[PDB]
Amino acid sequence: VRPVWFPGNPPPAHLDGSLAGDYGFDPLFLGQEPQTLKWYVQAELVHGRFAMLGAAGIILTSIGAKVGLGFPEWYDAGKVVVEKNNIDFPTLMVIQFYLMGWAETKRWYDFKNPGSQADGSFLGFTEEFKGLENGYPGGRFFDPMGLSRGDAAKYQEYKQKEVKNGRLAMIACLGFAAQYAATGKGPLDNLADHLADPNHVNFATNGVSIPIA
Amino acid sequence: DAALPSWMPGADLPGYLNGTLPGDFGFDPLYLGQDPVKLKWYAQAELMNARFAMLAVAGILVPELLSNIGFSWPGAGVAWYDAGKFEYFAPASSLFGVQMLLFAWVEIRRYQDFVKPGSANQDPIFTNNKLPDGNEPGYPGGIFDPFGWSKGDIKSLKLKEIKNGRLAMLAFAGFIGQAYTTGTTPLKNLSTHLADPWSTTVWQNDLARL
Amino acid sequence: RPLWLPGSTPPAHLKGDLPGDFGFDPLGLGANAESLKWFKESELVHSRWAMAAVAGILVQEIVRPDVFWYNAGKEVESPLGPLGLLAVEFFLMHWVEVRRWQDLRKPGSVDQDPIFSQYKLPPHEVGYPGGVFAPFIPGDLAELKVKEIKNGRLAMLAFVGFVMAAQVTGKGPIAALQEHLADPWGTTIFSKAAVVPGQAVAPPCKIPASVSYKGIEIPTPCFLQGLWP
Amino acid sequence: RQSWLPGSQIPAHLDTPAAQALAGNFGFDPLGLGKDPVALRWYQQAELIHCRTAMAGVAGILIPGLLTKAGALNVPEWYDAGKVAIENSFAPWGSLLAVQLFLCGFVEAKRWQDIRKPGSQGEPGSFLGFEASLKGTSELGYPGGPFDPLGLSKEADKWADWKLKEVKNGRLAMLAFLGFVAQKYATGAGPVDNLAAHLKDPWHVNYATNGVSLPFL
Numbered sequence: 059v060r061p062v063w064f065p066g067n068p069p070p071a072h073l074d075g076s077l078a079g080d081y082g083f084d085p086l087f088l089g090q091e092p093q094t095l096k097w098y099v100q101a102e103l104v105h106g107r108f109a110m111l112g113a114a115g116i117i118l119t120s121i122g123a124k125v126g127l128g129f130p131e132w133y134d135a136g137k138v139v140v141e142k143n144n145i146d147f148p149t150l151m152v153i154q155f156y157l158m159g160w161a162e163t164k165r166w167y168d169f170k171n172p173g174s175q176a177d178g179s180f181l182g183f184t185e186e187f188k189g190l191e192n193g194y195p196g197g198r199f200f201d202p203m204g205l206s207r208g209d210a211a212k213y214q215e216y217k218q219k220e221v222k223n224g225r226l227a228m229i230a231c232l233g234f235a236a237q238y239a240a241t242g243k244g245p246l247d248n249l250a251d252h253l254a255d256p257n258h259v260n261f262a263t264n265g266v267s268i269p270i271a
Numbered sequence: 272d273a274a275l276p277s278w279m280p281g282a283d284l285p286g287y288l289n290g291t292l293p294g295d296f297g298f299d300p301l302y303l304g305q306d307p308v309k310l311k312w313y314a315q316a317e318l319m320n321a322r323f324a325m326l327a328v329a330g331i332l333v334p335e336l337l338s339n340i341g342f343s344w345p346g347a348g349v350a351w352y353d354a355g356k357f358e359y360f361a362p363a364s365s366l367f368g369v370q371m372l373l374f375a376w377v378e379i380r381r382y383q384d385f386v387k388p389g390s391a392n393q394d395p396i397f398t399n400n401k402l403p404d405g406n407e408p409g410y411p412g413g414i415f416d417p418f419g420w421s422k423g424d425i426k427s428l429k430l431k432e433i434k435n436g437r438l439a440m441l442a443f444a445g446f447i448g449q450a451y452t453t454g455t456t457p458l459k460n461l462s463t464h465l466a467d468p469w470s471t472t473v474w475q476n477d478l479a480r481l
Numbered sequence: 482r483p484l485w486l487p488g489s490t491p492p493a494h495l496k497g498d499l500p501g502d503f504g505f506d507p508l509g510l511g512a513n514a515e516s517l518k519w520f521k522e523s524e525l526v527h528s529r530w531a532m533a534a535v536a537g538i539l540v541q542e543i544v545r546p547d548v549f550w551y552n553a554g555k556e557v558e559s560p561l562g563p564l565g566l567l568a569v570e571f572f573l574m575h576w577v578e579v580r581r582w583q584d585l586r587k588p589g590s591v592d593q594d595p596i597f598s599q600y601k602l603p604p605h606e607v608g609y610p611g612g613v614f615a616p617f618i619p620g621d622l623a624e625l626k627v628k629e630i631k632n633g634r635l636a637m638l639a640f641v642g643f644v645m646a647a648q649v650t651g652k653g654p655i656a657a658l659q660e661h662l663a664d665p666w667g668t669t670i671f672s673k674a675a676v677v678p679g680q681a682v683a684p685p686c687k688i689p690a691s692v693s694y695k696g697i698e699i700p701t702p703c704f705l706q707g708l709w710p
Numbered sequence: 711r712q713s714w715l716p717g718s719q720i721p722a723h724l725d726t727p728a729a730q731a732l733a734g735n736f737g738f739d740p741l742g743l744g745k746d747p748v749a750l751r752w753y754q755q756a757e758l759i760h761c762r763t764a765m766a767g768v769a770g771i772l773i774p775g776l777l778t779k780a781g782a783l784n785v786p787e788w789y790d791a792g793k794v795a796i797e798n799s800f801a802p803w804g805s806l807l808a809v810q811l812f813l814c815g816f817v818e819a820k821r822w823q824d825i826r827k828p829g830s831q832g833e834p835g836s837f838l839g840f841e842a843s844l845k846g847t848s849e850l851g852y853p854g855g856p857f858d859p860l861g862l863s864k865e866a867d868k869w870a871d872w873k874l875k876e877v878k879n880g881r882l883a884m885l886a887f888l889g890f891v892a893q894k895y896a897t898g899a900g901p902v903d904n905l906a907a908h909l910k911d912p913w914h915v916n917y918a919t920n921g922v923s924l925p926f927l
């Protein structure tokens with residue numbers, strides 16, 4: 059009934075169409091055990107949301123590089139920022155692990171004990187850290203505009219768009235790495251080359267993807 | 272948490288602040304006086320720090336203002352932060368030694384009253400002399416109120432005392448900051464501002480020092 | 482009830498109670514009641530600020546044509562230095578904004594004058610102070626509440642036009658209208674920019690990149706220039 | 711219940727009412743060292759002595775150091791003060807330590823026997839009339855009596871707060887001493903210099919840039 063990844067093949071039992079983006083895809087039954095499935099749900103959402111920010115960051119800075127605005131390529135930005143701004147790499151990295159560490163550990167213990175981060179232990183904040191659902195921590199800090207607490211159907215549709223856009227961005231970031239490794243150029247340089255010659259400038263003629271070509 | 276004056280009109284004030292202390296505007300954003308035994312100690316502390324700050328600010332600004340005018344005397348243009356190194360009749364050390372002895376007697380006499388109200392209202396030597404029974408820690412009265420003011424609107428007078436003290440405590444804090452930042456006396460700092468207020472804000476001053 | 486798209490069904494949350502309700506909430510931003518209460522005030526504040534800015538920028542261009550509004554901050558010179566002017570602005574706006582905010586957080590808790598006890602705003606609605614702030618009302622208040630929102634939504638969209646026109650043409654609102662009226666077929670953005678699969682063409686930023694002001698050098702960037710058509 | 715880690719499972723041995731009566735109980739014993747009540751009692755005594763020694767020592771390193779930095783003092787750095795003091799002393803270090811162990815061992819033995827049996831040091835006729843005061847209080851590790859000259863422990867409405875400040879300030883001073891040792895080995899300077907240097911350029915002067923703490927980055 060629900061569209062599946064391989065039309066004609068019955069959906070796995072541990073996939074009942076309840077989760078957003080449920081197309082019955084678990085060929086290696088990695089999410090067969092429930093608690094494991096809940097963990098993987100937060101994992102896909104966390105991976106996907108970072109990929110969406112990543113992809114949008116690379117695309118904008120790549121546009122600024124395509125035009126004459128002086129934005130470094132994604133694979134060269136890390137060195138430009140540290141060099142031009144004389145920023146100490148070790149300090150920045152440790153600061154990140156401090157901030158991410160705090161946010162990740164609080165998200166981790168919310169998964170282990172749902173609602174346990176809304177006791178007021180953190181500066182007396184209670185409701186902003188209770189969490190609505192696994193991988194969906196609404197409230198007034200994370201959902202400042204209330205889109206999750208208004209129109210249940212709109213919330214379900216938004217969840218479908220989020221997971222699908224996140225899986226697309228995760229595929230796009232794997233594409234940005236593979237294309238840079240195979241071509242040595244930027245992503246919007248690759249799109250301009252293809253658009254110029256789509257039949258003669260593609261992966262089949264890159265001299266790397268197909269070794270016998 | 273009633274209809275008494277508030278530091279932020281419209282806010283839910285702490286219930287523990289009920290308007291029994293002077294200047295109760297419900298201001299305890301960090302919930303320090305939530306515990307009653309701490310609040311009891313903090314009330315006296317605020318009154319003591321206020322009463323010394325009021326005397327200090329007076330004794331810091333009056334001499335400076337007299338200095339600006341033709342008033343002549345040993346101190347003259349002595350900056351408050353330079354008064355310690357000034358040469359007096361006795362060595363600083365000696366004076367400090369006397370100060371700590373003299374204060375040990377009065378502070379422990381005041382402290383006795385606070386721990387047991389009306390326990391130190393009698394002259395140890397001239398036993399006959401004493402303070403009127405009706406007494407609250409922080410308000411000894413008797414020979415400490417030689418003109419009878421306490422008899423009149425005491426609550427208003429206590430609110431005027433706390434208000435003037437909080438402003439004095441903030442003034443002294445200013446003197447400390449402005450002196451360490453502008454490296455000059457307070458009435459000089461005020462003259463600089465009154466000459467060109469627009470171009471004499473802490474923002475511009477600190478920006479220049481950066 | 483008139484709607485933004487004739488023949489369409491408005492969002493269930495958009496019944497028609499609020500002024501300016503033409504059933505327009507495609508993203509569902511106002512389906513939460515407490516969120517709608519904030520956005521309603523935000524739309525009013527944005528509207529009134531934009532209406533005054535669009536009026537001021539047009540008048541400033543007529544009275545002071547030589548001065549381009551975009552370059553006014555650096556050009557306007559007063560004896561009250563930039564910092565002195567800002568300090569005064571900061572304190573005055575902090576007070577008015579907190580007073581207005583507290584009205585939204587606790588309605589009816591800030592209608593009393595804090596210096597004169599004899600003066601208090603009558604019971605009212607958030608976004609509509611009235612009282613001393615409303616000495617005269619020329620007509621039905623409900624009708625003017627529709628006029629205010631409609632004239633405000635147009636002004637908010639005009640300002641954004643003045644900004645983009647300034648960065649694309651380097652001219653004030655009137656000077657642009659005249660450029661367009663001189664050659665409409667060659668003055669529209671379509672006649673200034675064009676993106677096709679083969680190539681991309683965008684009008685250049687006509688705003689200096691940095692301004693030198695009282696020995697500071699203020700960064701002055703164009704808006705999302707990289708994504709410009 | 712305050713928790714060292716909101717949402718974590720508190721050990722049942724730290725949720726027991728007697729354990730909750732202990733100051734500084736934030737449910738922190740990830741290694742399960744105090745599961746045994748008798749051990750928890752010895753470790754509570756051990757934590758109190760470490761806290762009170764660290765607070766006294768750290769105060770004797772920071773306070774003199776700041777005063778010297780100002781000028782009010784000329785004390786040598788904590789890691790150089792032994793050599794400076796023994797240089798012009800009346801006794802060599804070995805004699806001074808021998809006398810220390812004798813006097814410390816005696817008072818440490820009396821405290822020890824008080825842990826083995828609380829109130830034992832009040833044994834009548836054991837200390838020329840002082841044994842009466844040598845009996846502590848109902849709370850082990852809180853002798854009071856002559857050790858509380860101002861009788862602050864006599865105010866039951868302030869007892870808990872006072873003990874919490876002692877444990878939290880003690881745990882901080884214990885970590886401040888470990889920091890003084892680590893920073894000395896990683897910097898070659900004193901704790902007051904380390905503070906001033908970091909405050910001058912915090913983004914480039916830290917343990918990530920010391921060339922020791924993070925040998926991987």
Ligand code: CHL
Nearest residue numbers: 156159160163164167179180712713714715716717736738
């Ligand atoms: C005694 C040992 C002890 C240990 C080992 C931990 C360990 C931890 N606690 Mg915990 N706590 C401990 C005691 C206590 N905690 C708390 C209260 C909490 C709360 C409320 C929370 C934790 C949390 C955490 C975790 C934070 C995760 C992270 O990456 O943080 C590192 C993150 C940082 C931001 C590091 C902090 C700053 C860094 C040390 C450098 C400081 C730089 C500053 C510029 C300092 C400048 C000062 C100047 C300007 C004055 C973590 C595993 C958090 C958690 O994950 O809970 C699930 C959390 O929310 N603890 C209390 C009081 C009740 C404790 C003791 O009394």
Ligand code: CLA
Nearest residue numbers: 441442444445448449452453460461463464471472473476
């Ligand atoms: C009632 C206390 C009080 C008063 C009347 C003043 C007055 C003055 N200060 Mg100031 N100051 C104070 C406290 C105070 N200060 C405190 C507590 C500090 C922190 C320690 C400072 C630190 C400070 C610095 C660094 C500087 C000044 C400076 C100044 C002068 C003008 C520049 C300026 O406005 O800077 C800004 C002052 C502040 C932002 C402090 C806020 C004022 C306090 C909090 C009162 C709160 C406002 C309230 C409505 C009361 C108003 C005063 C009342 C009499 C009407 C001016 C005469 C500047 C100067 O020296 O000029 C040459 C200067 O650079 N002050």
Ligand code: CLA
Nearest residue numbers: 529530533534536537538540541544545548553554556557
């Ligand atoms: C948000 C509204 C706004 C803002 C930020 C500005 C800002 C500016 N205007 Mg302007 N203006 C506005 C509205 C505004 N105007 C309106 C509505 C009109 C039509 C009446 C004008 C007509 C106008 C002219 C004719 C000129 C300016 C000029 C200027 C520039 C310098 C003059 C100056 O402000 O000196 C100081 C301003 C004053 C001392 C006046 C004080 C403010 C009055 C007296 C109080 C009114 C308070 C009001 C009730 C508050 C609600 C307003 C609302 C926006 C919140 C400056 C950047 C001048 C310029 O372009 O310089 C090159 C200039 O020639 N404006």
Ligand SMILES: CC1=C[C@H](O)CC(C)(C)[C@H]1/C=C/C(C)=C/C=C/C(C)=C/C=C/C=C(C)/C=C/C=C(C)/C=C/C1=C(C)C[C@H](O)CC1(C)C
Nearest residue numbers: 739740741742743760763764767770788791884885887888
């Ligand atoms: C609880 C828990 C539980 C779970 O289960 C697990 C775990 C985690 C393991 C645990 C934890 C633990 C810890 C953290 C510990 C730490 C400790 C310390 C740091 C101590 C110090 C400690 C420290 C201390 C005592 C200190 C001491 C010091 C002193 C005396 C001083 C001395 C001196 C001075 C004055 C000066 C001179 O010139 C020199 C000298 C001679 C040097």
